[PDB]
């Protein structure tokens with residue numbers, strides 16, 4: 001049956017959650033809502049509980065709510081954030097206005113771990129391995145994260161990793177000397193073309209390098225500065241990639257730059273495992289068609305001690321035909337309601 005709910009003012013709003021969730025404590029800002037830590041008495045797990053803010057105030061918002069719910073309900077992988085629970089105090093569609101999402105509480109993110117410092121090679125192997133394991137899974141469902149960065153990567157005490165916030169930033173927050181842009185592939189940063197899944201492999205490259213050196217790979221002070229930093233390392237594009245830049249505007253700007261050759265990565269990453277160097281070179285390729293994929297990278301010699309072809313699963317098919325669908329608010333809200341009602345908890 002329907003559990004009993006109790007009310008409690010947290011942050012600015014009134015939170016109405018089932019009794020099973022106790023000791024609710026405001027933690028931080030999440031994707032499109034505020035998060036609380038709580039103790040789930042049914043499972044014994046410490047959980048993060050997100051209440052979405054105005055989930056149905058516009059078509060843009062309503063579809064976004066449906067999208068996040070659809071995405072979280074699909075993901076069943078060790079290295080990817082999963083949904084423990086989803087609930088509404090509403091007893092019917094007509095009184096349905098709020099959505100709460102529940103996942104595992106994570107200890108820290110990857111920012112806190114790096115902490116200006118170099119990590120050991122074996123720690124880097126393990127963390128990148130897990131990211132690539134989760135990405136293989138995500139990509140096999142034709143889902144792109146689009147915004148991988150250390151703050152989207154949560155790790156527990158055992159250095160066990162989960163990927164957060166996939167498949168979902170305003171112009172202002174991508175401006176200047178900001179971590180929100182430092183991990184973005186150049187084709188997406190400057191909208192060169194219709195982009196694919198390998199945008200995420202570029203991000204892994206930036207993260208891996210940061211874990212190896214303890215320093216941001218491309219700490220651009222703005223879009224242009226960052227592009228220059230990128231092209232100094234990987235070289236200016238050739239005719240081949242230029243043809244693929246469908247924006248006539250961007251292609252024209254690229255051509256104005258003095259041609260630069262690719263740098264030697266062994267001289268950039270001094271003291272690093274030659275196998276780590278090799279992988280970085282295959283990840284940080286300017287032409288996205290030629291980047292290593294997650295499945296391919298898992299088989300790279302650098303991960304020899306973790307790689308297991310029989311323990312690197314793919315996803316069930318993910319139907320995202322709704323993405324090209326135009327619906328009314330109430331229609332997106334009804335679809336969202338069906339998804340809440342039909343939720344079945346994990347083992």
Ligand SMILES: Cn1c(=O)c(Oc2ccccc2)cc2cnc(NC3CCOCC3)nc21
Pocket residue numbers: 028029030031035048049050072081101102103104105106107108109154164
């Ligand atoms: C920042 N964040 C989320 O945005 C988040 O989003 C949700 C997704 C689905 C349902 C509910 C919430 C969950 C989450 C869990 N755990 C930590 N742990 C943090 C502790 C403090 O260090 C950083 C990691 N963060 C989290």
